[PDB]
Design a protein around this ligand. Structure first.
Ligand SMILES: CC1=C(/C=C/C(C)=C/C=C/C(C)=C/C=C/C=C(C)/C=C/C=C(C)/C=C/C2=C(C)C(=O)CCC2(C)C)C(C)(C)C[C@H](O)C1
Ligand SMILES: CC1=C(/C=C/C(C)=C/C=C/C(C)=C/C=C/C=C(C)/C=C/C=C(C)/C=C/C2=C(C)C(=O)CCC2(C)C)C(C)(C)C[C@H](O)C1
Ligand SMILES: CC1=C(/C=C/C(C)=C/C=C/C(C)=C/C=C/C=C(C)/C=C/C=C(C)/C=C/C2=C(C)C(=O)CCC2(C)C)C(C)(C)C[C@H](O)C1
Ligand SMILES: CC1=C(/C=C/C(C)=C/C=C/C(C)=C/C=C/C=C(C)/C=C/C=C(C)/C=C/C2=C(C)C(=O)CCC2(C)C)C(C)(C)C[C@H](O)C1
Ligand SMILES: CC1=C(/C=C/C(C)=C/C=C/C(C)=C/C=C/C=C(C)/C=C/C=C(C)/C=C/C2=C(C)C(=O)CCC2(C)C)C(C)(C)C[C@H](O)C1
Lengths: 304, 305, 305, 305, 305, 306
């Protein structure tokens, strides 16, 4: 049994690979078209969904970068934003690249407000997207909201130029206030402990469920391998999620292993209750019940 | 009054029609998926519920069939099990079809031990169910244990093709002085009470006399079994060593001086004993002399029923 | 390769097995609840979808049965419809059972008109369904129209007992110069394209030559139909005037130099024409010379498949 | 003017971004599904299109790597090929990663021959792709052949593990007297015509002189390659034996006395010769002396671009 | 913002300007060649697409003109049709010029039937088109059908010379309960959806209220029609019994808090029904209160747009 | 008998360059700013190999007030003024533009082009990109022979403005008799045809018009026939000065009613480009029994092989 081989459990699960396909089409585009396109998507999405403000901590970490850009003349400001999209090698891009995903998003959240207010150079008035860019935005607006926000997030995290800065780790939720999840057909203690500890931000307890060499595969990314690496991923990116699993199925695997698939919804704190993402979890447990591998899949539709 | 019309007494009774619904989904599947799915369901269920071993008599009746399969090579052992699931017409299927449900079940119990042990071709390692099959197993594992075992039982009895009728020996009735008696809140009707008590006693010759000559018994999700001869045969082949635990009932008049009675409670099958209580309703239509014209037995949709 | 093993090609295809599961729930119900339920579904569906009238030939084949029922009193008329739903053994059921599906459907279409007009005993006024029957109708009305009409068709086809075999006359094939041809993204395979084109042309004699002698066709939720004669009989009795509108497909090698091809698209039945598009997958297993060893036709679970 | 800003000249040009989108869907897949999928695409494409054999030089550079895999047992051979697809870090993957695209492609061409013959572990018999994998192949088979081969090329080139750069020997330029010359409707620009003519002649040393020191070339779906040294290296490692067939173009002024030129036509890769015509656009940005500051090459979305 | 500046929203949209280009080529031809060319295209197109007969009203408004031509000798009949094509100034041309397009088209439809029957002077026997005319017809026959019928429509509408204004009677709006509603991927905008639904319903009075007072509608290849009065007149004279089938769209902000929306899909004219689907783009420029300041309708160059 | 419109069909095998009106129709669909950008682009690219002849003093003076009013406006309004001409909007500038002869309109735009180059009139925004349709239209124009290129640009320019007050340059006095060269045409000794060529090459319009029947017509390339001596003479005087007609070969055939039809092919040079653009032309004459021109069509030919 290998991690890479474990990637193939439950092969009928239809993942929303329109998300990675759409990101790839986006990445082909001219940098100004990327910027205009996100700007457009945001303004038109923002009419029905309201994004949550970035936390105080994240705002503080982005503040110097946000001030340096605002101080520059209007062309330099547009050049700085193109450099991020083109993944150019500048000091700003290196700083952007060391940020955690929440800070990159908080940074762009704030540039968007300043562009609305007119204090940072906005997208030229009446600008028109290229043929390819219009098709890419057309595709995004046809996606359900959960897939829409995942496309926008991933385009934003990909900017910059490849020390690592993240927000402070929130202390785990006090035990007496923890609700527990219930899953039709799934009484497996490891899976239930997986949801409950993640909903409580109790990463130290969560990581103990994994084998030493175990792996976690977030949506559309390569598996993250080893307790050290998976715990880091928890701490930098998985605070304040809300996991709402609904049903599951349990099957034996090779070597006395067990494979469990659960489907349900997740809410990210950036949108709270206004975007429910349809998610599947695919677990491969070893004979003592440790997680050897868990994949998280953004589902292609609710009919899955 | 007709048997088919009598099927409609107490129409608010909510039967667990999810059981026959799942069986219909199961039957669509590819034969190897059926076998894999039951094998999977068995292994995952078997961690918390322990199935009773088949009786010596039943084991004996299944032995010639079990040895021919074990003797064949692994390619043809799995072909033989697919022929059963596909309900193909082979000599093994013809003989399998003549068996009573308990013998069909014992046959498969024994293949399960040999597959675990590695002496009969097992489900290929790391086999993955098709989309429809995974959903079907997801549904099964979401059921109450009582509904799970009924889905599996009916899926198993359903295998084979389409003659001789082979069943275990009929056990002698329980001695009279050793019989306990049921008590039912709201129900003193002697016929209903004699029906429960004699079935808990395996006294099928006394039970059958409660029925009118043309009367019918409708087991869960099946067509009515009509006539004393057919209903007795069903008693003798499938209703031994049940435990009927009725709890409450209600009594109402029907047309023509008939009386209809509904009783709800639990039943224990000897395959699982006290570890699976099925929630059951019995629906009686009694004629004016108290004879059973019709009795339906329902697997209930939930404990709230 | 066996036909039964070929049933498992493209196991990811999610068929709409809610259709057979809903049929199984329907079949548990009291006969009068079946009749009421269909009657209700018909009235509510008929507000937005209009059923095509049965053909002259079919109307004539059912006419004798239709006049005998109308001549009976209102009690016996309702008895006659219950016998059909209960699958009772009567002359009417024996005659109904020998009819082709289109003739059964036309038979009921005409009973529905007479019930509207008040000339055949209707569903009692203000009749209320049983708990299980309400749940079944709720489920049906929640399905896409393609699945709704399939449930109703199969519930209707399953009535009667269990005799010749009566079907309408075979319509002659479409004139060659008038035939359009389908186009399928990713599929230039001559056998697949000739399969679609000849069925849209009702050219069954050409269609059947595409099959291996022992080949099989598996209609939605049915067992495979095996052998050229059996598959040809099926074409001639049930597959006239369909409209096949395939859209895209994928082509893969199979064992032993065989080829498996999956096609997805829509089909239109003449009973509803363009008002109901069913989402269909075809699964072909072609042998090395390109003949159809097996073709399964799947009603898809949703438009996302 | 920046190279990155120059990427946006002629924004109406619709590139075939289904190619990078399809590659991204491919990259999500399980390693065995990627391999099975390409193997499937190959067998089905190879019935109508024949790929050219790898050159002697390339075959020799791949020689020891192919023997090591062939010497291993069947499980380890399949592990070795998974390691390449999973982009695992093994010495073989490091070796594969140092090869030029033509050598990587020759490596896989030869594994395909051995798998057909049965001398390298093949895709398991009757293997079935996963849901996502079936959809990805369906998409590939619906593309124009020019897009198919580009998807396949790019998926294989991306295997391995992200040093020393091994490539085939550089073929000396075509003798001057046998060189044909292109003609382009509406385009007399000397630089553009010299770009086509010298690339068709494999005269990379002359070609590179058309570029400014800081100029860039952007191959289909890649980031620009910047600087004469980098662009020359790309010519020498990947652009031998192409056939460029430009047809029409348009010339417009740009900022600062620059000139922007778009040309459309076809290209043939030596792997397929005249059997795959790719529809290509070239987008030139020339400085005032006629040097190429930027040239993008686009795979067009269809023949009407 | 001006109407003329708004004409440039979504400049990447490639309209089928081969249509106005071939009409311009047609307009150069000798009058008899125009008539022969249409006569030829009509006969050759009419083998696979059949035109809808003009309505009772339309036939009635053109009747007096059609009866005068039939009364003249064959020489003068041909002179009269030449006068129409040459845009000569005669009383017949003045009356033809006052007709709405549907009346002009119905007029020629009927001349086409009389010419076949031999009652109106036809295209001379064995006539051969001029060099330019043959090229023009070749171009037309190479166009997709949506573009063919548009070329023919516009050639016909352009004949005559050069108050009053005659059109058919206005069809009353479709009653509210029978109206279907369109759905557009990515477009929930109330104004865009109200635009489609009211036009598919012929509810021009509700439709026109969607426009700003100074707003404009630009039909395919025409100058924008400006002001509610002019746009309403256009709706009433030319846009009855269309069928709008929008499929997908994209929404972007414009200057001044405006919004621009592009939608692509198909339309059906009642002249050809479902046998010709034209590929259409709609381009909306909406002001902050959601009103249509500008809407352009484009015939698309191909299905790839 | 014979009508002007029927006479349009003589020598129907003549293949005219109908790509020219086809491209003009494609041009006219475009956004107004695209039309202006496109011509500007075509102009700069053509201007590397062909140089336009300067407008005459008279024409410049007639366009002078119009050009001064535009230069005085701000850059936003200058561009508005030019869009109004392309959009054929109704402004005083458009009404004045429309009353001008073709040569004055062309001189108007020649001069705006110089001021745009210099930066004194609002130029095409830097790095502007044409729309998809406009790019295809420019590609087509650059694929045409130069004779067809300049005809497309001429006609797009003449079409601008807004639908009598008719302004033209002064009429040049006819060439002195002793200085007139005469043409020679292989296969054509017809006195009317030869006098037609010789008098047009001499700007002797009063003599030319006497060659026509009273009801005769002249049909310039891609336009409707101009009918009647007064109308045809007006056309000569406003648009046909300083041409050079170089006929080469012809063919002579009888027509109905004792008429004669003659087709001549050759080249013509306009004074805007002189000898740097030869247009390939056919003339199609329908002559009555006394030798008068009932109808003469002038065709821009599709290629040199026609
Ligand atoms: C970039 C840009 C602009 C700014 C755009 C902005 C502000 C975009 C912001 C978008 C955001 C906030 C999107 C948020 C997305 C969040 C997502 C998709 C979170 C998903 C998390 C998932 C699904 C979690 C799954 C997990 C589960 C359930 C587990 O069990 C294990 C952990 C794991 C994380 C995998 C503007 C300024 C608008 C224009 C400018 O030109 C360019
Ligand atoms: C029964 C009843 C009543 C009457 C009900 C009526 C009139 C119901 C009528 C329903 C009908 C007309 C349903 C029509 C269904 C037709 C279907 C679903 C046809 C599907 C055909 C398919 C999917 C074709 C597939 C094929 C393809 C594409 C192939 O490639 C091979 C052939 C094959 C057939 C498999 C009333 C009178 C209303 C009340 C009464 O109490 C009881
Ligand atoms: C990977 C694998 C398998 C093997 C697969 C094989 C052998 C696939 C081979 C595919 C190949 C040979 C594809 C080749 C494609 C070549 C293309 C797309 C070349 C295009 C080049 C272009 C467009 C050139 C453009 C250029 C122009 C015109 C310029 O002006 C500048 C240079 C530039 C290169 C950009 C098998 C063994 C079958 C199964 C196994 O499980 C996995
Ligand atoms: C002329 C002639 C002959 C007769 C020719 C005939 C009868 C030809 C008839 C052709 C017809 C019926 C063509 C009809 C064309 C219809 C079209 C192209 C309608 C298209 C309308 C569209 C695209 C609607 C678009 C709209 C939408 C979608 C909106 O949202 C707003 C309104 C608007 C109308 C713009 C014959 C007799 C054959 C020979 C003789 O010598 C000469
Ligand atoms: C419009 C504009 C711009 C300016 C463009 C300019 C200056 C264009 C100028 C083009 C010119 C000078 C074109 C000239 C064309 C001349 C032609 C094609 C004349 C042909 C005459 C012929 C063929 C004569 C034929 C005749 C003969 C032979 C006869 O026998 C009888 C008389 C007749 C006239 C018919 C700029 C400023 C560049 C950009 C701005 O955005 C927009």
């Amino acid at each position: 049994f290998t991690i890479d081989s474990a990637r193939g459990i439950f092969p009928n699960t239809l993942a929303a690979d329109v998300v990675p396909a759409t990101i790839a089409r986006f990445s082909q585009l001219n940098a100004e078209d990327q910027l205009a396109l996100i700007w457009f998507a945001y303004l038109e999405m923002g009419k029905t969904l309201t994004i949550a403000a970035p936390g105080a901590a994240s705002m503080q970490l982005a503040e110097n970068a946000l001030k340096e850009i605002q101080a520059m003349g209007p062309l330099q400001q547009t050049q700085a934003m193109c450099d991020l999209a083109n993944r150019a090698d500048t000091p700003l891009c290196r700083t952007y690249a060391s940020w955690s995903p929440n800070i990159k998003l908080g940074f762009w959240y704030r540039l968007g407000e300043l562009m609305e207010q007119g204090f940072v150079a906005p997208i030229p008035a009446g600008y028109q997207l290229s043929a390819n860019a219009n098709a890419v935005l057309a595709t995004i607006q046809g996606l359900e909201s959960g897939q829409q926000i995942t496309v926008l997030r991933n385009a934003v995290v990909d900017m910059g130029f490849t020390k690592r800065i993240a927000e402070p780790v929130v202390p785990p939720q006090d035990t007496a206030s923890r609700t527990k999840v219930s899953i039709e057909g799934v009484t497996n203690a490891t899976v239930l402990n997986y949801m409950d500890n993640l909903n409580a931000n109790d990463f130290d307890t969560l990581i103990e469920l994994f084998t030493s060499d175990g792996a976690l595969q977030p949506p559309f990314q390569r598996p993250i391998v080893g307790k050290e690496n998976v715990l880091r991923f928890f701490r930098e990116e998985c605070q304040n999620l809300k996991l709402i699993p609904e049903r599951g199925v349990t099957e034996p695997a090779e070597d006395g292993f067990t494979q469990i698939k659960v489907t349900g919804k997740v809410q990210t704190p950036w949108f709270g209750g206004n975007v429910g993402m349809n998610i599947a979890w695919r677990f491969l447990l070893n004979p003592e019940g440790k997680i050897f591998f868990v994949a998280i899949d953004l589902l292609a539709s609710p009919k899955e």
